[PDB]
Swiss-Prot record:
First-listed, main subcellular location of the protein, grouped into a coarse class: cytoplasm
Functional summary from the UniProt entry: Cytosolic CRABPs may regulate the access of retinoic acid to the nuclear retinoic acid receptors.
Cytoplasm among keywords: yes
Name of the molecule in the record: Cellular retinoic acid-binding protein 1
Compartment(s) where it occurs, according to its Swiss-Prot or TrEMBL record: Cytoplasm
Keyword ATP-binding among record annotations: no
One Pfam family per UniProt: Lipocalin
Binding-site residues for all-trans-retinoate, renumbered to this chain: R131, I132, Y133
Domain remark text: Forms a beta-barrel structure that accommodates hydrophobic ligands in its interior.
Gene Ontology molecular-function annotations: fatty acid binding; identical protein binding; retinal binding; retinoic acid binding; retinol binding
Gene field: CRABP1
Keywords for this protein: Cytoplasm, Retinol-binding, Transport, Vitamin A
């Protein structure tokens, strides 16, 4: 499956509840939720090699990884973590995160390519956030 290209968000669900579950300050969530509404996503892929740039006005993250090989990135709430990308299935990547410093909610994300739509999922313990993207 090809995740490469530029994507824009079609819908988000529970992004605020996610930030709640991760203990983010109501005023920060206000800013985050706002910025997260109009995110721009760039994905360059080469087999298991992935480049994903996510941009908003107040924060842009650039992650690079090889499915099957751990890498370092940040959690949704900015905490630096250790990540473990894996092919859950042919078109879905599952990624487990373990915080480098401190302790917190068990988090992970999963990116799935389904019907030319990119389904992004953020988990913070029991809370699940679903963000659907379409090819811009
Ligand atoms: C105000 C500030 C600095 C506070 C710290 C946290 C709470 C860490 C934070 C998080 C975001 N996150 C996003 O903007 C975002 C956009 C798109 C996606 C996605 O769909 O991939 C995910 C997250 C934006 C701003 C901030």
């Amino acid at each position: 499956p090809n995740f490469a290209g530029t994507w824009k968000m079609r819908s988000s669900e529970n992004f605020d509840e996610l930030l709640k579950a991760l203990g983010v300050n109501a005023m920060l969530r206000k800013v985050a939720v706002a910025a997260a509404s109009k995110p721009h996503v760039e994905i360059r892929q080469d087999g298991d090699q992935f480049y994903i740039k996510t941009s908003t006005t107040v924060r842009t993250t650039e992650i690079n990884f090889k499915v099957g090989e751990g890498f370092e990135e940040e959690t949704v709430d900015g905490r630096k973590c250790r990540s473990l990308p894996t092919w859950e299935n042919e078109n879905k990547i599952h990624c487990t995160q373990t915080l480098l410093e401190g302790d917190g909610p068990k988090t992970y994300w999963t990116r799935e390519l389904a019907n030319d739509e990119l389904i992004l999922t953020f988990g913070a313990d029991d809370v699940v956030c679903t963000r659907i993207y379409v090819r811009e």
